[PDB]
């Protein structure tokens, strides 16, 4: 059983001043739309999801912070409710059908299908609010991001059904999306009332720093949520388990290897994003700031939420983040799916 040390983060804390109201309003939202079973919802409303959103969009427009918080709770509604603690999470094919239908609800709330499902009803409310604060492009990107997430958790469900653990390369590829990190990105733009143009947003290097944020956020989560996951009775996947199997490591060794990986991605992210900011648009500079807010917001929330601290069986969490890495090198990760990120240096 493990000790998680303070992790390296060069980003300063920030939070929206109305974080408390937002957290209350998200709990009310979960109740209004009856998101999750009574048991699951009871947990979710106590997990400071509004506070989390307030750290992701610390200077964002309040209505969007609220939208993002409701969305993050909805996402746990599907991820906990179906994928990790539901029957559909062992049935990749059935899962795929449900998620395809939910995509259609997100595209067309008016379509007379899944009119009885609470998750669908919640999604319609979210889409309606995306229509207020987003362009057509951002809305489609939000839907495409939902599909990315949905396709990756069907793949995760294949592993859960077979009880298998993917190799590091497959895990990384999967984990870039199955943490529902890319779905947040359009709302970062909406939160500040601008649209990131395709020539920047879809530029290979800008996509890369977005993936780096996803990697750091999911790896930091793997580290912080390890306790909560390992001690649960259900199947679980994370970087530590993958590294134990792949490199024949103990949990403690797997922890250190994981920390070294996210440290190197943290450093790369900072360097490449600074390069991009120097000659990017004002919108790109704001986007890159929001990626920092997302990473650090997930860091502060990860060590504080009862979702990870689990008071009934307390996690051993650090209280602070350090401002220097354990792994200082610019040696690329030995992971084919992401090693190309280091080609972006010059
Ligand atoms: Mg999950
Ligand atoms: Mg989970
Ligand atoms: Mg986790």
- Quick one: residue 19, left, alpha or beta (phi over 0 = left, psi -120 to 50 = alpha)? alpha
Place of tokens 């610390």: 58
Q: Any known ligand binding at 307?
A: yes
Closest CA to 90 of 234, 190, 294, 240: 234
Query: What is the 228 CA–ligand 1 centroid distance (Å)?
Result: 12
DSSP code, position 285: H
Closest CA to 281 of 203, 343, 210, 345: 203
Structure tokens at 240: 């530590």
Return the half-sphere exposure (C-beta side, CA atoms, 13 A cut-off) of residue 228: 17
Dihedrals φ, ψ of 205, to 5°?
Answer: -70, -35
Closest CA to 259 of 301, 210, 318, 340: 318
Domain 1-346, CATH homologous superfamily name and number: Farnesyl Diphosphate Synthase (1.10.600.10)
Q: What is the dihedral of CA 225, 228, 232, 236, to 10 degrees?
A: 0
- Relative to the alpha carbon of 153, which ligand is closest? 1
Burial of 90 per CB tally in 10 Å (0-12, 13-18, 19+): middle
Tell me how many degrees the CA angle 59-65-69 measures, rounded to the nearest 5.
140
> Could you tell me if 8 and 321 are in contact, meaning their C-beta atoms sit under 8 angstroms apart?
yes
Question: CA 281, CA 312: separation in Å to the nearest integer?
Answer: 48
Place of tokens 């889409």: 127
Cβ atoms within 10 Å, residue 55: 24
Structure tokens at 139: 């809305």
Burial of 46 per CB tally in 10 Å (0-12, 13-18, 19+): middle
Helix (H/G/I), strand (E/B), else coil: 8: strand
Query: What is the 197 CA–ligand 1 centroid distance (Å)?
Result: 30
Strand partners, 322: 8
> Could you tell me if 245 and 253 are in contact, meaning their C-beta atoms sit under 8 angstroms apart?
no
DSSP code, position 182: T
Helix (H/G/I), strand (E/B), else coil: 216: helix
Place of tokens 């750290």: 55
Question: CA 298, CA 226: separation in Å to the nearest integer?
Answer: 15
Closest CA to 297 of 33, 29, 49, 5: 49
Distance of CA 224 to the CA centre of its chain: 13
Query: What is the 181 CA–ligand 1 centroid distance (Å)?
Result: 11
Question: How far is CA 222 from each of CA 187, 205, 214, 305, rounded to the nearest angstrom?
Answer: 24, 25, 12, 14
Query: What is the 81 CA–ligand 3 centroid distance (Å)?
Result: 15
Question: How far is CA 318 from each of CA 6, 133, 143, 252, 322, rounded to the nearest angstrom?
Answer: 5, 37, 36, 16, 10
- Relative to the alpha carbon of 228, which ligand is closest? 3
Helix (H/G/I), strand (E/B), else coil: 322: strand
Query: What is the 90 CA–ligand 1 centroid distance (Å)?
Result: 13
114-145: string of b/e by CB count within 10 Å (b at 16+)?
Answer: beeebbbbbbbbbbebbeebbeeebbebbbeb
Structure tokens at 164: 């298998």
Structure tokens at 88: 């559909």
């Amino acid at each position: 059983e493990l000790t998680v040390p303070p992790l390296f983060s060069p980003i300063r804390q920030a939070i929206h001043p109305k974080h408390a109201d937002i957290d209350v309003q998200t709990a009310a939202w979960a109740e209004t739309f009856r998101i999750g079973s009574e048991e699951l919802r009871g947990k979710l409303v106590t997990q400071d999801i509004g506070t989390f959103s307030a750290r992701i969009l610390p200077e964002g427009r309040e209505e969007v912070v609220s939208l993002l918080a409701d969305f993050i709770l909805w996402l746990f509604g599907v991820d906990d409710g179906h994928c990790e603690e539901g029957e559909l999470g062992h049935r990749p094919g059935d899962l795929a059908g449900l998620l395809h239908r939910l995509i259609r609800v997100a595209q067309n709330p008016e379509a007379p299908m899944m009119q009885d499902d609470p998750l669908a009803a919640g999604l319609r409310d979210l889409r309606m609010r995306v229509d207020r604060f987003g362009t057509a492009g951002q809305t489609a990107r939000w839907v495409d991001a939902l599909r990315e997430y949905f396709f990756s958790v069907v793949w995760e469900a294949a592993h859960r059904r077979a009880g298998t653990v993917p190799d590091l390369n497959d895990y990384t590829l999967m984990r870039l999306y199955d943490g529902a990190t890319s779905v947040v990105l359009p709302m970062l733009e909406m939160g500040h009332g601008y649209e990131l143009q395709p020539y920047e947003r879809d530029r290979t290097a800008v996509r890369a720093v977005a993936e780096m944020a996803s990697f750091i956020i999911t790896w930091d989560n793997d580290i912080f949520s390890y306790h909560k996951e390992r001690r649960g009775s259900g199947y679980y996947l994370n970087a530590l388990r993958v590294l134990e199997q792949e490199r024949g490591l103990t949990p403690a060794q797997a922890l250190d290897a994981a920390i070294s990986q996210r440290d190197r991605v943290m450093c790369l992210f900072t360097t490449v994003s600074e390069q991009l900011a120097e000659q990017g648009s004002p919108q790109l500079r704001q986007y890159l700031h929001s990626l920092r807010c997302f990473i650090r917001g997930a860091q502060d929330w990860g060590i504080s939420s009862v979702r990870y601290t689990t008071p009934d069986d307390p996690a051993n969490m650090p209280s602070v983040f350090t401002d220097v890495p354990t792994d200082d090198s610019t040696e690329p990760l030995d992971i084919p799916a992401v090693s190309w990120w280091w080609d972006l240096l010059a």
